[PDB]
Each structure stands twice: as structure tokens, then as C-alpha cells.
Design an enzyme around this catalytic site. Structure first.
Site, PDB file in Angstrom:
ATOM      1  N   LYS A  49       0.862  -0.959  -0.029  1.00  0.00           N
ATOM      2  CA  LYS A  49      -0.091   0.004   0.121  1.00  0.00           C
ATOM      3  C   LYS A  49       0.809   1.493   0.043  1.00  0.00           C
ATOM      4  N   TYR A  50       1.530   1.654   0.213  1.00  0.00           N
ATOM      5  CA  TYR A  50       2.732   2.702   1.000  1.00  0.00           C
ATOM      6  C   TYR A  50       3.520   2.409   0.725  1.00  0.00           C
ATOM      7  N   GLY A  66       7.571   3.704   1.419  1.00  0.00           N
ATOM      8  CA  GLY A  66       7.287   5.426   2.254  1.00  0.00           C
ATOM      9  C   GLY A  66       6.881   4.876   3.042  1.00  0.00           C
ATOM     10  N   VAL A  90       4.279   5.192   6.778  1.00  0.00           N
ATOM     11  CA  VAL A  90       3.203   5.934   7.179  1.00  0.00           C
ATOM     12  C   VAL A  90       4.394   6.725   7.038  1.00  0.00           C
ATOM     13  N   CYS A  91       5.370   7.404   7.104  1.00  0.00           N
ATOM     14  CA  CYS A  91       5.786   8.519   7.016  1.00  0.00           C
ATOM     15  C   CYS A  91       5.842   9.399   6.173  1.00  0.00           C
ATOM     16  N   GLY A 103       5.696  -1.927  11.226  1.00  0.00           N
ATOM     17  CA  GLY A 103       5.063  -1.002  11.408  1.00  0.00           C
ATOM     18  C   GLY A 103       4.014  -1.024  12.491  1.00  0.00           C
ATOM     19  N   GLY A 143      -5.062  12.402  23.781  1.00  0.00           N
ATOM     20  CA  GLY A 143      -2.991  12.271  23.890  1.00  0.00           C
ATOM     21  C   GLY A 143      -2.277  13.268  23.515  1.00  0.00           C
ATOM     22  N   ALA A 195      11.400   7.780  12.483  1.00  0.00           N
ATOM     23  CA  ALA A 195      11.446   7.749  11.568  1.00  0.00           C
ATOM     24  C   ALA A 195      12.551   7.589  11.104  1.00  0.00           C
ATOM     25  N   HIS A 232      28.032  33.877  14.886  1.00  0.00           N
ATOM     26  CA  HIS A 232      26.563  34.841  15.378  1.00  0.00           C
ATOM     27  C   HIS A 232      25.951  36.009  14.218  1.00  0.00           C
TER      28      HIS A 232
HETATM   29  C1  FAD Z   1      25.742  45.543   8.827  1.00  0.00           C
HETATM   30  C2  FAD Z   1      26.762  44.925   9.484  1.00  0.00           C
HETATM   31  C3  FAD Z   1      26.594  43.172   9.426  1.00  0.00           C
HETATM   32  C4  FAD Z   1      26.720  42.356  10.404  1.00  0.00           C
HETATM   33  N1  FAD Z   1      26.360  41.281  10.804  1.00  0.00           N
HETATM   34  C5  FAD Z   1      27.218  40.256  10.983  1.00  0.00           C
HETATM   35  C6  FAD Z   1      26.813  39.246  11.416  1.00  0.00           C
HETATM   36  O1  FAD Z   1      25.491  38.713  10.681  1.00  0.00           O
HETATM   37  N2  FAD Z   1      28.218  38.235  11.804  1.00  0.00           N
HETATM   38  C7  FAD Z   1      28.951  38.462  12.486  1.00  0.00           C
HETATM   39  O2  FAD Z   1      29.817  37.551  13.261  1.00  0.00           O
HETATM   40  N3  FAD Z   1      29.197  39.744  11.768  1.00  0.00           N
HETATM   41  C8  FAD Z   1      28.858  40.662  11.561  1.00  0.00           C
HETATM   42  N4  FAD Z   1      29.533  42.008  11.305  1.00  0.00           N
HETATM   43  C9  FAD Z   1      30.507  41.987  11.489  1.00  0.00           C
HETATM   44  C10 FAD Z   1      30.648  42.363  12.733  1.00  0.00           C
HETATM   45  O3  FAD Z   1      29.261  43.811  13.201  1.00  0.00           O
HETATM   46  C11 FAD Z   1      31.951  42.435  13.532  1.00  0.00           C
HETATM   47  O4  FAD Z   1      32.380  41.488  12.956  1.00  0.00           O
HETATM   48  C12 FAD Z   1      32.293  43.111  14.664  1.00  0.00           C
HETATM   49  O5  FAD Z   1      30.945  44.028  15.593  1.00  0.00           O
HETATM   50  C13 FAD Z   1      33.448  43.677  15.483  1.00  0.00           C
HETATM   51  O6  FAD Z   1      33.923  43.545  16.772  1.00  0.00           O
HETATM   52  P1  FAD Z   1      34.899  44.070  17.503  1.00  0.00           P
HETATM   53  O7  FAD Z   1      34.644  44.101  19.532  1.00  0.00           O
HETATM   54  O8  FAD Z   1      35.604  43.650  16.730  1.00  0.00           O
HETATM   55  O9  FAD Z   1      34.530  45.385  16.601  1.00  0.00           O
HETATM   56  P2  FAD Z   1      33.524  46.706  16.509  1.00  0.00           P
HETATM   57  O10 FAD Z   1      32.737  45.501  17.185  1.00  0.00           O
HETATM   58  O11 FAD Z   1      33.784  46.811  15.933  1.00  0.00           O
HETATM   59  O12 FAD Z   1      33.889  47.355  18.088  1.00  0.00           O
HETATM   60  C14 FAD Z   1      34.705  47.956  18.477  1.00  0.00           C
HETATM   61  C15 FAD Z   1      34.078  49.472  19.724  1.00  0.00           C
HETATM   62  O13 FAD Z   1      35.579  50.043  19.460  1.00  0.00           O
HETATM   63  C16 FAD Z   1      35.529  51.762  19.835  1.00  0.00           C
HETATM   64  N5  FAD Z   1      36.320  52.320  20.082  1.00  0.00           N
HETATM   65  C17 FAD Z   1      37.390  52.606  18.983  1.00  0.00           C
HETATM   66  N6  FAD Z   1      38.479  52.743  19.239  1.00  0.00           N
HETATM   67  C18 FAD Z   1      38.713  53.625  20.350  1.00  0.00           C
HETATM   68  C19 FAD Z   1      39.689  54.210  21.491  1.00  0.00           C
HETATM   69  N7  FAD Z   1      40.264  54.820  20.747  1.00  0.00           N
HETATM   70  N8  FAD Z   1      38.787  54.455  22.317  1.00  0.00           N
HETATM   71  C20 FAD Z   1      37.775  54.037  23.063  1.00  0.00           C
HETATM   72  N9  FAD Z   1      36.471  52.787  22.277  1.00  0.00           N
HETATM   73  C21 FAD Z   1      36.992  52.637  20.974  1.00  0.00           C
HETATM   74  C22 FAD Z   1      34.141  51.981  18.778  1.00  0.00           C
HETATM   75  O14 FAD Z   1      33.988  53.324  19.340  1.00  0.00           O
HETATM   76  C23 FAD Z   1      33.492  50.446  18.521  1.00  0.00           C
HETATM   77  O15 FAD Z   1      32.475  50.380  19.573  1.00  0.00           O
HETATM   78  C24 FAD Z   1      28.339  42.843  10.527  1.00  0.00           C
HETATM   79  C25 FAD Z   1      28.679  44.126  10.362  1.00  0.00           C
HETATM   80  C26 FAD Z   1      28.278  45.045   9.603  1.00  0.00           C
HETATM   81  C27 FAD Z   1      28.603  46.299   9.574  1.00  0.00           C
HETATM   82  C1  FAD Z   2       0.538  12.086  11.603  1.00  0.00           C
HETATM   83  C2  FAD Z   2       2.093  11.366  12.249  1.00  0.00           C
HETATM   84  C3  FAD Z   2       3.150  12.097  12.418  1.00  0.00           C
HETATM   85  C4  FAD Z   2       4.508  11.505  12.298  1.00  0.00           C
HETATM   86  N1  FAD Z   2       5.806  12.925  12.077  1.00  0.00           N
HETATM   87  C5  FAD Z   2       7.325  12.409  12.668  1.00  0.00           C
HETATM   88  C6  FAD Z   2       8.135  12.904  12.712  1.00  0.00           C
HETATM   89  O1  FAD Z   2       7.725  14.770  11.888  1.00  0.00           O
HETATM   90  N2  FAD Z   2       9.284  12.292  12.691  1.00  0.00           N
HETATM   91  C7  FAD Z   2       9.820  11.316  13.421  1.00  0.00           C
HETATM   92  O2  FAD Z   2      10.442  10.763  13.421  1.00  0.00           O
HETATM   93  N3  FAD Z   2       8.351  10.764  12.743  1.00  0.00           N
HETATM   94  C8  FAD Z   2       7.010  10.967  12.635  1.00  0.00           C
HETATM   95  N4  FAD Z   2       5.778   9.646  13.142  1.00  0.00           N
HETATM   96  C9  FAD Z   2       6.028   8.476  12.904  1.00  0.00           C
HETATM   97  C10 FAD Z   2       6.390   7.833  11.455  1.00  0.00           C
HETATM   98  O3  FAD Z   2       5.910   7.929  10.490  1.00  0.00           O
HETATM   99  C11 FAD Z   2       6.911   6.539  11.757  1.00  0.00           C
HETATM  100  O4  FAD Z   2       7.751   6.670  12.936  1.00  0.00           O
HETATM  101  C12 FAD Z   2       7.526   5.488  10.834  1.00  0.00           C
HETATM  102  O5  FAD Z   2       6.773   5.941   9.929  1.00  0.00           O
HETATM  103  C13 FAD Z   2       8.274   4.227  10.823  1.00  0.00           C
HETATM  104  O6  FAD Z   2       8.383   3.856  10.207  1.00  0.00           O
HETATM  105  P1  FAD Z   2       8.712   1.834  10.036  1.00  0.00           P
HETATM  106  O7  FAD Z   2       9.741   1.387   8.815  1.00  0.00           O
HETATM  107  O8  FAD Z   2       8.953   1.702  11.220  1.00  0.00           O
HETATM  108  O9  FAD Z   2       6.804   1.307   9.807  1.00  0.00           O
HETATM  109  P2  FAD Z   2       6.060   2.474   8.296  1.00  0.00           P
HETATM  110  O10 FAD Z   2       6.510   3.759   8.170  1.00  0.00           O
HETATM  111  O11 FAD Z   2       4.502   2.124   9.475  1.00  0.00           O
HETATM  112  O12 FAD Z   2       5.414   1.226   7.330  1.00  0.00           O
HETATM  113  C14 FAD Z   2       4.988  -0.201   7.654  1.00  0.00           C
HETATM  114  C15 FAD Z   2       4.692  -0.668   6.415  1.00  0.00           C
HETATM  115  O13 FAD Z   2       4.357  -2.392   6.919  1.00  0.00           O
HETATM  116  C16 FAD Z   2       3.532  -2.334   5.689  1.00  0.00           C
HETATM  117  N5  FAD Z   2       3.444  -3.419   6.422  1.00  0.00           N
HETATM  118  C17 FAD Z   2       2.638  -4.489   7.347  1.00  0.00           C
HETATM  119  N6  FAD Z   2       2.451  -5.238   7.728  1.00  0.00           N
HETATM  120  C18 FAD Z   2       3.221  -6.194   6.543  1.00  0.00           C
HETATM  121  C19 FAD Z   2       2.467  -7.358   5.569  1.00  0.00           C
HETATM  122  N7  FAD Z   2       2.576  -8.611   6.444  1.00  0.00           N
HETATM  123  N8  FAD Z   2       2.903  -7.254   4.861  1.00  0.00           N
HETATM  124  C20 FAD Z   2       3.660  -6.220   3.885  1.00  0.00           C
HETATM  125  N9  FAD Z   2       3.696  -4.546   4.027  1.00  0.00           N
HETATM  126  C21 FAD Z   2       3.626  -4.709   5.565  1.00  0.00           C
HETATM  127  C22 FAD Z   2       2.700  -0.909   5.953  1.00  0.00           C
HETATM  128  O14 FAD Z   2       1.652  -1.408   5.014  1.00  0.00           O
HETATM  129  C23 FAD Z   2       3.667  -0.039   5.572  1.00  0.00           C
HETATM  130  O15 FAD Z   2       4.056   0.157   4.836  1.00  0.00           O
HETATM  131  C24 FAD Z   2       4.529  10.292  12.889  1.00  0.00           C
HETATM  132  C25 FAD Z   2       3.723   9.244  12.424  1.00  0.00           C
HETATM  133  C26 FAD Z   2       2.311  10.510  11.777  1.00  0.00           C
HETATM  134  C27 FAD Z   2       1.377   8.990  12.198  1.00  0.00           C
END
Ligand code: FAD
Ligand code: FAD
Ligand code: U4I
Ligand code: U4I
Lengths: 464, 464
Positions: free
Chosen positions: B35-36, B38, B40-41, B143, B178, B317, B443
Site C-alpha cells: 500500500k504505502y 515510504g 506511514v511517514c 510498522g 492524547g 522515522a 553569530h
Molecule cells: C551591517 C553589518 C552587519 C554585520 N552582520 C554580522 C553578522 O551577522 N555576524 C557577524 O559575526 N558579524 C557581523 N558583522 C560584523 C561585526 O559587526 C563585527 O565583526 C564586530 O562588530 C567586530 O567586533 P569588535 O569588537 O572587533 O569591534 P566593533 O564591534 O567594531 O567595536 C569596536 C568599538 O571600539 C570603539 N573604539 C574604537 N577606537 C576606540 C578608542 N580609541 N577608544 C575607545 N573605544 C574605541 C568603537 O567606538 C567601537 O564601538 C556585521 C557588520 C556590519 C557593518
Molecule cells: C501523523 C504522524 C506524524 C509523524 N511525524 C513524525 C515525524 O515528524 N518524525 C518522525 O521521526 N516520525 C514521525 N512519525 C512516525 C513515523 O511515521 C514512524 O516512526 C515511521 O513511519 C516508522 O517507520 P516503519 O518503517 O517502522 O513503518 P511504517 O512507516 O509504518 O511502514 C510499515 C509498512 O509495512 C507495511 N506492512 C505491514 N504489514 C505488512 C506485511 N505483512 N507485508 C507487507 N507489508 C506490510 C505497511 O503497509 C506499511 O507501509 C509520525 C507518524 C504519524 C502517524
């Protein structure tokens, strides 16, 4: 001339985390900051940009996908409310930094620090006063500043991320110089809010630091979004004419003009090294004008450290925090672990689909002489990605064939930034594809694509 | 008549993955399913339910968060279109299974299999007729089926997940028996599409297998959604009156009558063990009427294995797939790794917020005599959760104090099902909290909460 065991210069993620860690270790700590508690990241960077990106994602859903989800009706979106939310999010996290400063009994100094010598900092206080502070150790955490296209200047319509992210009102059209993470993220937010967007990149791929397969996918996705990306294109000049900005570019050896209302300069970031007496402290710069450091974040002056963007190693917030921990632990003489090759650290871009990567690209690993194995699993074979409605993208893992040690990982797809921890944990602690393939991943999750890649590195994929 | 090295009974995630792995190991394989494809999953379980859950989550976002995201307009949502998309998703994944079977040169047998003895299977073919298959090894992967409240029966208004998930139209009101993952997920979907939902749970909390802190948080969110959950309440009778169903429940000896248009029975699942000749093969059942197995999934008949939900170990699964790989590798004599204590395997519930966990709850770890250390980080201290607009929930890790070995992890929050892989990899390969705390997390991601929990297990959290 008050004295502290540790003075931290700058209160971005690197500085304020280094100060928490030093305080945890029993060190009297002061942190000096004039402007941004939480730094660029919390005030005008990571935090507000991820809020704006979520808003933009919901526009993209309740706009391009509403029909496929059974959603009907005329929907409008207001960027000003997105802006307002981003500022309230940023302000709440900044208040968090101050809370942590007080919790850890760290002294805040509200001003700008200039070194007088290797153990003395002069501070221009925000209140107009001037004060001196001595220290046994200093942690320089002063960040980076936007690099401008050579020969160009900022103006009313030519802005860095800072002015753009602080704008409540959007232009009709924008040209973004630079297709790195910042430029791509701003392009994603503005295009979803109805701005014409052109992104201009000098290198031949968008996100040129990524694996080329990832660049190709994100280019395709942005084209489908309606963003024009011009690669292998050099920005020659930027002229703000008031009612329009004219960008002169060279592409295919031919000069051409692009026009828009606004221009965002996002071509990279230069360490903040000028104007605060690095020379009086004796601190040496690298040839790239970053502060040189060793693996423990030590400059050439043994008691002065430099963490975060100012050392230029990998300009990201989690890198800055981790470097701040290493420096504080090294000062205290506590057990630490260095970060090693910074290429192995994780990173992500938070447009949709996300891009998330660590380590070497396939081409880099081949060029460096590894015996390269590659496994690539597409999200069209992932049950969760179909359920969420976005089966685009893939996971690509690069491993060395001697033992199946990971060399890098390259992900593009829905929310894939959350999927890196298992990969960097394995790389750092020497678990191979054979150990990773035995780790059972919950179904149905995007993370199952990791486990199929592990299977492909060690033998054959199963669900592919 | 025809002979195979391995015959697999059932083509759910357990059966069809076991057949692929057997094929990869060079064993001639057939798979019998009426039947299935893949199971139930893929047809009526994980795959379509996560599609409906995504549709419901988008309803929730517009309905409750439209204003805060700056989204305006009168919007309607059509459950019929959610239903249609869930079926299209399911049908594509089933076509995938068939492709995988043909790629791996696996023989499909379209019928229902009955054991004639320990090495012969009689197949009643779908196309009429009977075929006899002989085998050297068999993998029973048949299953489970819904367990009904004792004394009740199915009818037009009293359904299992199967009739409910195949319904394109929704009732005005429903009582769910449940509060397991299935009951909670359907409650989340139906309430967001405007159904009045009551969930009745015999045990004193919703999601009672989870850590009590997780149950308390999910009960809070569901109450805010408007779902009535009645815990420590026993369903005693279900009477379908055609125009209404009356459910009699009792708590503390007081009886009460609940009425709704429909009732969904979701109190558990019983392994499928009747009607296909287990007695003729000689295969023994446990006291709970599951097929008994050892750590390599072998039944008491050494060449007959039983995998997935029919062994009742952990009816999920990814568990069925993992057990299928172990059975196939054991048959072939390939190197394998048993799953060990199944309580350490990961699991998740995909309402919003997600719930995701592995291993021991804090109370179970205390009751089993570990020296328990707990670290809990709320998402209110996580920058990504605020940007996404959902800072609710937490990550709670349970470790043993001697070396910081992980005993369990319990997550509730936005999309946290993707965060388990690093935790289960560390638990399986003996990486302790002090190794995990050094793994740099990107970060800003929800995964940073993991890293802060590691800091708390070994010392002091930094950003909390
Ligand atoms: C738009 C944008 C998005 C970013 N997104 C990410 C991200 O998602 N992930 C990530 O990892 N990095 C990201 N970055 C980079 C991240 O901002 C920098 O790597 C991080 O801020 C570096 O930290 P830091 O402490 O080295 O310096 P900074 O955060 O630059 O801080 C240095 C500080 O020193 C001070 N300072 C400087 N000179 C002096 C002084 N003489 N006396 C006293 N204080 C002083 C300044 O005023 C400043 O506040 C992003 C950067 C930008 C511009
Ligand atoms: C609504 C729902 C949501 C779920 N969500 C998750 C999830 O997010 N993550 C997760 O890990 N698990 C989830 N599960 C559980 C997951 O579906 C099961 O753990 C998984 O399907 C088990 O796999 P299995 O191979 O043991 O059996 P099954 O997937 O049940 O397959 C068994 C198969 O054996 C066949 N069969 C039975 N008897 C015979 C026979 N005599 N001859 C031949 N074929 C036969 C059946 O027809 C069936 O297709 C969910 C289950 C449900 C019901
Ligand atoms: C006991 C108690 O109540 N403590 C408390 C009170 C108020 C606020 C906070 N903490 C924050 O505000 C956390 N922020 C500062 S953060 O920007 O979210 C952030 C920033 C970075 C770089 C990394 C993370 C990473 F942890 F995810 C989070 C703690
Ligand atoms: C080489 C090539 O062309 N191969 C190909 C072609 C067409 C389809 C597929 N594969 C599927 O369709 C995968 N499915 C069956 S699945 O339901 O998504 C699924 C189910 C389960 C239990 C676990 C996963 C886990 F992997 F995420 C995914 C492969």
C-alpha cells in the site's frame, strides 16, 4: 591615574566579552568606549540587520509565495515599522551589555582612549574631561571602519552601512558596491521592500570568498529575486549629483555609467589603527595595516593584546568574542585553547537562502595538495525542505581521503546557518566522516542533509 | 519459488532504507509492500504533517504578528490549499522511494506478505494471485497502528491521524485524545485554521516524555494560542451521535462530558504483529506485544530481524532508518555500531515553538544516580531570537559532574529541532562540556544558546 589589571579599549563583542572573561577570572577590569556599547554588531550591525532581514523574508513570503500557501488578500508592508523594530531590538541588546557590565563589576569609562605609553591610556571623557588610566595589561578591541572605493567620498547619497541601516526611509533605487555578505544582505532587504537594486562586484562571482558552487547558487537566487548583479566589474568613480548618483564602471574592458538615487559602499573593512597612539604603545602593524598578533592574541608588546576586527583575521562577531576569551584567559594564566587556522572558523550570510560555511573550498583544498573527497546533497532530496516550501540549495562537504577528516563545508539553503556546529565540532576534535555518519539526525530536518553527506564521504549516500 | 539473500517486509523508512543498505552491501534484496511505499511517514505521517505545520505557522505569523512586522491587509487562509500542497509533497517523496529502489536494483513485490515458515514468505499480490519467496534473511519492518481508547471505535466523526490528515475540510471543533507529539501537532494546525481544539491527556503534563520544564513551557504557549489542554484527565468513553460526539472524561473522580464535531484518537501506537504468520516463522513477542530484538535488531530467530516501530523501542522515522542500517550491516557481516540505549536518540515536535530533546531529563538523571549539573539559557538572551521575533523558550543541558559528560538536552524555541546534531555527536563520541565550550558558534544564531549552556556546565555563562 587609576589602575586596573586589565583595560579593554572598545566595547564591541570582542571587548565586552573579553572584559566579562577577565572579570570572571578575578582581574580588576575597566572598559573604555565613547559611542557604541556592544560595538558595531549590536548597534548598527549583526543585531539590527538580522531583524530587518527577517522582516524582508516575511515580505518575500507573503508576496511571492502567498498563493502557493493558500493566502489571499491585498497585503502592504511598511519599512518604517521594520526600521522601528530593528532599533528597539538593538536598544534592548545594548541594555543587555550594560547589565552584564554591572553583573560582572566591570568599570565603564565613557570616552575615547589614546595610549601615552605601553602602560598608560589617556581618555577624552564624553563629559569633556580628560583622565588617565594605567594598567598591567591592555586588550585592544577597537574594530574596523568601512573601506571606500579609491578616489571616492561619502556624501548625502553615498553612504556606508551605518547611514543606510539608520535610515527609516528607502530610496527608489540603489547601487551597492561590493557583493560580500553585507552588500548581499542589504540587497536582499531593499529589493524585497521594492527598491531597484544593482550590486557591483570586482571579482568574477558574488560572495567570492565562498565555494564557487555556492556563489553560483546565490547568484541564481538573487536573479530570481530581481536583483541585478554585475560581476567582474570595477567601480571607477562615484559622482553624487544630488538628484541622482552616477557610478562609472568598467566591464568587459568598456567604461559604462550606472545611475541610482543612492550608492552603498560595502567593499570591505579596514582595521581602526590610526589616531589613538598605537605608536606610543609600541604596537606593530602588519603589512595589511592590521595589528599583528600571535595565536594567543598577543601583539609584539607582551602585555598588550588585540582582538576582533582590528587584527583583521576574520572580521566577525563570534570570532571577536572567541579571541577575547583567549586573550583574557592568557592574561590570567588560565587554561585556554587557541583558535588555530582562522579559515576553519564558521561564518554565514543571512539573506534567504542562507549561506553558511567553514574551512576550505573544494578548489582551495585541491590547490593546497589534499587528497580531496567531495559529497554534495541537494535539498530537493530532503523532506523538511519540501515541507517548508524551499527545496533549493545543497550541502557540500570537502574531506581528506586519508581518514575522512573534514576540510570544509559549504551550505546554501533555508536557514542553514544553524547547521554548522556539528561540522566544526568534528573538525576541531578530529572526528572523521566515519564517526559523523553514525550520528543519527532527527527526521524530518534540514540537518539530515549533513548525515547523507557523511554517508557519501565514507561510501554511498542512502536517500540520494 | 524465487530466492533472495534478504527479503524486507514493509516499505516504510525502516524497510526501504534497510533494503538500500543491504543492496549496497551486495545482498540480493526484495521488498514487499501492499500500500504505502515510504510507509506511514512519507504518505500520511512525517512528510505531509510538516507541510501542514508550515502552513499553520504562516497563519500564526500573519494573525498574531502582522502588526508588529508592519504588515497590513485583510487576508484569508484556505486550508484546502494547505491540504493540496501536503499531498503534492507526499506524492513527490513516494516517487523518490521508487527511484531509490530501482537505482539500487531492489526488487519491489506489490502485495502483502505472510510467513509460511522461517524461510518462506507467501505474498498475496495486489494484482491477484500468490507468489512464494524464500530467503536466507528477513527484515520485518511492518510498522504500527493507532491504539484506540479501550471500548471505543472509529466512525465518521471519530478518526485516527490517517483519516484526519487526509481530510481536505476541517470541523468547527475537535477533541484530541492524547497530548503526545501527534496530538499536539494536529492541535497546532487545526487551532491556527480556526478550529476550537481541546486536548485531553491522561498524564499530568503535555508532551509527558519531555523534561517537565519543556512541558510547562509548551503548555504555556498552547494556552496562549487558545488550545484547551486538560491534563491528568482520563477519556473513558467516546459516543458519536452523528451531529456531535460526546467524550466523557474524568479527573479526581469527577466526571465531565465534552462535546465537539469530531474526535481524533492519538493516544499511542501498537506494533503490527497479527495476521502475517509470525507464529509460523517462530518469532517471539515481548510482554507489550512488540517484536523482541537484541542490540543488532535480531529476533529470537537468528536470521530474522525486526526494525522500526514494530519493535516498539522508539517509534520514530530516523530510528527506523538507523535500525535498518544495523540489521543490513549485521546480515552482511559489515562493520556496524549498535544504537545502545534508545533514550539517547534525538526526537522533536514541530509545532511552534519546536520542542527537541535527547537523552535523560533532569529528573531521570537524578533518579538514576548521576552527579547532575544543569545549565539553562533562555532565548531572551539570544540576539537571533529577538531578530526573528520569537525570544521564547530555552536550551537546558543535563550533564554529569565528574567529567562533564552530556546526559540529555531539552530545547524549546523557534526551529530548535535543527540544533540537536552537535549534542548527540558529543554524547556518542565522548566529547565533554569542556570540549564543546571551545566550539565557536556563528553569530547571530539560535545555536549560540548551545555554546552558552556549555559555558555554564563548565564554569560561568558569559552572555547570560
Ligand atoms: C551591517 C553589518 C552587519 C554585520 N552582520 C554580522 C553578522 O551577522 N555576524 C557577524 O559575526 N558579524 C557581523 N558583522 C560584523 C561585526 O559587526 C563585527 O565583526 C564586530 O562588530 C567586530 O567586533 P569588535 O569588537 O572587533 O569591534 P566593533 O564591534 O567594531 O567595536 C569596536 C568599538 O571600539 C570603539 N573604539 C574604537 N577606537 C576606540 C578608542 N580609541 N577608544 C575607545 N573605544 C574605541 C568603537 O567606538 C567601537 O564601538 C556585521 C557588520 C556590519 C557593518
Ligand atoms: C501523523 C504522524 C506524524 C509523524 N511525524 C513524525 C515525524 O515528524 N518524525 C518522525 O521521526 N516520525 C514521525 N512519525 C512516525 C513515523 O511515521 C514512524 O516512526 C515511521 O513511519 C516508522 O517507520 P516503519 O518503517 O517502522 O513503518 P511504517 O512507516 O509504518 O511502514 C510499515 C509498512 O509495512 C507495511 N506492512 C505491514 N504489514 C505488512 C506485511 N505483512 N507485508 C507487507 N507489508 C506490510 C505497511 O503497509 C506499511 O507501509 C509520525 C507518524 C504519524 C502517524
Ligand atoms: C541573569 C540575567 O538576567 N542576565 C541577562 C540580562 C539581560 C540581558 C542578558 N544578555 C543579553 O542581552 C545578550 N546580549 C548582550 S545579545 O545581544 O543578545 C548577544 C550578543 C552576542 C555577541 C552573543 C550572544 C549569544 F549569547 F547569543 C548574545 C543577560
Ligand atoms: C541520484 C538521484 O537522483 N537521487 C534521487 C532522486 C530523486 C529522489 C531522491 N531522494 C528522495 O526523494 C528522498 N526521500 C525519499 S525523502 O522523503 O525526501 C527522505 C525520507 C527520509 C526517511 C529521510 C530523508 C533524508 F535524506 F532527508 C529524505 C533521490
Amino acid at each position: 591615574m587609576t589602575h586596573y589589571d586589565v583595560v579593554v579599549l572598545g566595547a564591541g563583542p570582542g571587548g565586552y566579552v573579553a572584559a566579562i572573561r577577565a572579570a570572571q577570572l578575578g582581574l580588576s577590569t575597566a572598559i573604555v568606549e565613547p559611542k557604541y556599547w556592544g560595538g558595531v554588531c549590536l548597534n548598527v550591525g549583526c543585531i539590527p540587520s538580522k531583524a530587518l532581514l527577517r522582516n524582508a523574508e516575511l515580505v518575500h513570503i507573503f508576496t511571492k509565495d502567498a498563493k502557493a500557501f493558500g493566502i489571499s488578500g491585498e497585503v502592504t508592508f511598511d519599512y518604517g515599522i521594520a526600521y522601528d523594530r530593528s532599533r528597539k531590538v538593538a536598544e534592548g541588546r545594548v541594555a543587555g551589555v550594560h547589565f552584564l557590565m554591572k553583573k560582572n563589576k566591570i568599570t565603564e569609562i565613557h570616552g575615547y582612549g589614546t595610549f601615552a605609553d605601553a602602560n598608560t591610556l589617556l581618555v577624552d571623557l564624553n563629559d569633556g574631561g580628560t583622565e588617565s588610566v594605567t594598567f598591567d595589561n591592555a586588550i585592544i578591541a577597537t574594530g574596523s571602519s568601512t573601506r571606500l572605493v579609491p578616489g571616492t567620498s561619502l556624501s548625502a547619497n553615498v553612504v556606508t552601512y551605518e547611514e543606510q541601516i539608520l535610515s527609516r526611509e528607502l530610496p527608489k533605487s540603489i547601487i551597492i558596491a561590493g557583493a560580500g555578505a553585507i552588500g548581499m544582505e542589504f540587497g536582499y532587504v531593499l529589493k524585497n521592500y521594492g527598491v531597484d537594486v544593482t550590486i557591483v562586484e570586482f571579482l568574477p562571482r558574488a560572495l567570492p570568498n565562498e565555494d564557487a558552487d555556492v556563489s553560483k547558487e546565490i547568484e541564481k537566487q538573487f536573479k530570481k529575486l530581481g536583483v541585478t548583479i554585475l560581476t567582474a566589474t570595477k567601480v571607477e568613480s562615484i559622482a553624487d549629483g544630488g538628484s541622482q548618483v552616477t557610478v562609472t564602471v568598467t566591464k568587459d574592458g568598456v567604461a559604462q555609467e550606472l545611475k541610482a538615487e543612492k550608492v552603498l559602499q560595502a567593499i570591505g573593512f579596514a582595521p581602526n589603527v590610526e589616531g589613538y597612539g598605537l605608536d606610543k604603545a609600541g604596537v606593530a602593524l602588519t603589512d595589511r595595516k592590521a595589528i599583528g598578533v600571535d595565536d594567543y592574541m598577543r601583539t609584539n608588546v607582551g602585555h598588550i593584546y588585540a582582538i576582533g576586527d582590528v587584527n583583521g583575521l576574520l572580521q566577525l562577531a563570534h570570532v571577536a568574542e572567541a579571541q577575547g576569551v583567549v586573550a583574557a584567559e592568557t592574561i590570567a594564566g588560565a587554561e585556554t585553547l587557541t583558535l588555530g587556522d582562522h579559515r576553519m572558523l564558521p561564518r554565514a550570510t543571512f539573506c534567504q537562502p542562507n549561506v553558511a560555511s567553514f574551512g576550505l573550498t573544494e578548489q582551495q583544498a585541491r590547490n593546497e595538495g589534499y587528497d580531496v573527497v567531495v559529497a554534495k546533497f541537494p535539498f530537493t532530496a530532503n523532506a523538511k525542505a519540501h515541507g517548508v516550501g524551499d527545496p533549493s540549495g545543497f550541502v557540500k562537504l570537502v574531506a581528506d581521503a586519508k581518514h575522512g577528516e573534514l576540510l570544509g563545508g559549504h551550505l546554501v539553503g533555508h536557514d542553514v546557518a544553524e547547521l554548522l556546529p556539528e561540522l566544526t565540532l568534528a573538525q576541531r576534535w578530529d572526528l572523521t566522516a566515519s564517526e559523523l555518519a553514525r550520528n543519527v539526525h532527527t527526521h524530518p530536518t534540514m540537518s539530515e542533509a549533513l548525515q547523507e553527506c557523511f554517508h557519501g564521504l565514507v561510501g554511498h549516500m542512502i536517500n540520494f
